[PDB]
Amino acid sequence: SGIPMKQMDLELPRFSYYPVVKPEPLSKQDTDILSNYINPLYLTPDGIEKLSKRFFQDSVIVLVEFLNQEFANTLLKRIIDAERQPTPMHSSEVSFPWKTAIPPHKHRYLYLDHEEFGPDIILPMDLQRLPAFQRWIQLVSGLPLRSFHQVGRRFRPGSDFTLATTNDTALLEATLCLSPGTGIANTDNGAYDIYMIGDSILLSLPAAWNVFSLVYRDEGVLQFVKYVSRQAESSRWDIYSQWNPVAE
């Protein structure tokens, strides 16, 4: 028993879900578009077919060297530069358009809303909003997807985290990790992505540079990003997206 009633109003971000285009084969234009973002390794006909098979069989795939290297390089320079700057530890110190996830006992991290774009947002928020990508992920995951939302995130060291939460329905989840720090990559300092039940651990994904993880999240599975210790000396940068399967 408890008192008073559970009240969940005090919490940001609040994710709204967006429509996904219908599943179709990739066109020449689709691959032309995606080639400016993603490793050609993962865009060829047989490459995608090989991805489809590993995901069907394992219900998870982790892809090193995900983004096109030339593209990744431009992101790397920007992330290094941001890391050079004073780490914003107060809301008043956070640069537009970043926002702080609240309240502290639920989670803490800096984030970019789904639709966010601009020359100075560092994360590639436009990628997963592309119809071409939405066709790609449905092909790769073998799942027609009804809707989705993405969030660009920065987990500052000695501060940021998410706590374990459950999903009522099954979700397809993707995390594009763009964390180049040496410290963040060491799971002693946390920052790793966990999936577990109710041993319990299903997946443990360390922070990494240019790694794309795709996970079939069964209903009732716990998920969270482990608290980033001071000793990390750098942030975990990623984009986290959840997709609702067409499933009935």
Please give the full DSSP string across 98-167, using - where no structure is assigned: -EE-B-TTTEE-EEE-TT---SS--S-TTGGGSHHHHHHHHHHHT--EEEEEEEEEEE-TTT-EE--B--
- Taking the C-alpha atoms of residue 169 and residue 247, their distance in angstroms, rounded to an integer, is 10
With both helix axes pointing from N to C terminus, report the angle between 131-141 and 45-58 in degrees, rounded to the nearest 10. Answer: 50
Gaps in the chain after residue (C–N beyond 2.5 Å):
198
- Per DSSP, what are the bridge partners of residue 213? 62, 175
Angle at 87 between CA 241 and CA 102, to 5 degrees: 50
Please name which of 155, 134, 158 lies closest in space to residue 146, comparing C-alpha atoms: 134
Sign of the CA dihedral running 41, 42, 43, 44: positive
Tokens of 157: 């060291």
Helix, strand, coil: what percent of the chain each, to 5?
25, 30, 45
Show the DSSP H helices in the chain as ranges. 28-34, 45-58, 69-84, 131-141
In a 10 Å sphere around its CB, with 0-12 CB exposed, 13-18 middle and 19+ buried, how is residue 200 labelled? exposed
DSSP single-letter state for residue 10: S
Q: Calculate the CA dihedral of residues 238, 36, 244, 151 and round it to 10 degrees.
A: 30
Strand 99-100 to 236-245 pairing: unpaired
Beta bridge partners, 151, equal: 240
Number of H helices, E strands in the chain: 4, 13
